[PDB]
Amino acid sequence: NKSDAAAKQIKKLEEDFDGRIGVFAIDTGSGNTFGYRSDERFPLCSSFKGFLAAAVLERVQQKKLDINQKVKYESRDLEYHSPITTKYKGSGMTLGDMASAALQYSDNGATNIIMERFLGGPEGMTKFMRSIGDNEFRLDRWELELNTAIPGDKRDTSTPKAVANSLNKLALGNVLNAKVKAIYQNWLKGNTTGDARIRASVPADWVVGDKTGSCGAYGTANDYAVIWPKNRAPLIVSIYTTRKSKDDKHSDKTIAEASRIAIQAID
């Protein structure tokens, strides 16, 4: 019933903006799920940086990396949108700071430095995802080439369900031990780019940790969140959108609204 009505609303929403919305949402307290195009592929854009940070933490937990190790790059030409790395260029940053910059600010320099030195590049990032049983995820290119969002291109894509499940594994499951998962969770909660997406869809008193992506082509954008309501179990929401034309702007309000609908369906 509620599921049928939610489906109709997403559909109207995708027609209203001549685009494509994929949704997966889970109420971890009740088991309730909702999916719309949940097994279809969508560009990840910046949203994979949330997982890159999870990979970094797993490496620290396995003791291959130290969270306070210094990462120096004084002579590295930084990629476009390196707001955090560019201010620490002189002195370097700790591993954990760079990784949380990758997540919380979408820092492209942080991203590509981490993939280059600690994670084995895009194939290594893909391998990490495979290792938690995510068969859908792939990253193939570096920042910024990975953001082309060309329709019909499987490169740098995933599905909403796989995103949701993976997040549930990393933020809520036991890939990460209690102490390291707490940190990951805090990184998610302090994300600075998601105010007009999933966070906008929920009472202000609910706690959200999220990671957004905005390819800036084909109107492509997304957000995934763990959500802690008061006196209830966490929710997981995954929202992915594209648009028909290359020049199309992304719509924060469609994302926020698809989130409202996904949440109402599962609650």
Ligand X SMILES: *C(=O)N1C[C@H](NOS(=O)(=O)O)C=C(C)[C@H]1C(N)=O
**Inter-residue contact 9 to 264 (CB < 8 Å):** no
Binding flags for Cl ion, 130-149, as an x/- string (CB under 5 A): ------------x-------
Annotated catalytic residue: which of 46, 47, 201, 214?
46
Q: How many residues bind Cl ion (CB under 5 A)?
A: 1
**Tokens, residue 234:** 């966490």
Tell me, yes or no, if 47 is annotated catalytic.
Answer: no
Annotated catalytic residue: which of 40, 123, 131, 145?
145
**Which residues sit opposite 233 in a β-bridge?**
none
Q: Is 157 annotated as a binding residue?
A: no
Q: Is 108 annotated as a binding residue?
A: yes
Q: From the CB of 111, what's the least distance to ligand X, in Å? A: 9
CA 65, CA 258: separation in Å to the nearest integer? 39
Tell me, yes or no, if 46 is annotated catalytic.
Answer: yes
Residues 6+ apart with CB under 8 A from 92: 70, 71, 72, 73, 74
- Which residues of the shown chain bind ligand X in the complex (CB under 6 A)? 45-46, 81, 106, 144, 147, 193, 212-216
Alpha helix segments (H runs only) across the chain:
2-16, 49-61, 95-105, 108-114, 121-130, 160-167, 178-189, 252-266
CB count in 10 Å sphere of residue 180: 16
228 is a site residue for Cl ion (CB under 5 A): no
Question: What angle, rounded to 10 degrees, do the helices at 95-105 and 49-61 form?
Answer: 160
Binding flags for Cl ion, 91-130, as an x/- string (CB under 5 A): ----------------------------------------
**Inter-residue contact 193 to 222 (CB < 8 Å):** no
* CB closer to Cl ion, 113 vs 236: 113
Phi, psi angle pair for 61, to nearest 5°: -60, -40
User: Choosing among ligand X, Cl ion, none, which partner's interface includes residue 142 (Cβ < 5 to 8 Å by kind)?
Assistant: Cl ion
Q: Is 49 annotated as a binding residue?
A: yes
* CB closer to Cl ion, 142 vs 206: 142
Q: From the CB of 139, what's the least distance to Cl ion, in Å? A: 12
Active site residues per annotation: 46, 145
Which residues are known binding-site members? 46, 49, 106, 108, 212
Annotated binding-site residues for a beta-lactam read 46, 49, 106, 108, 212
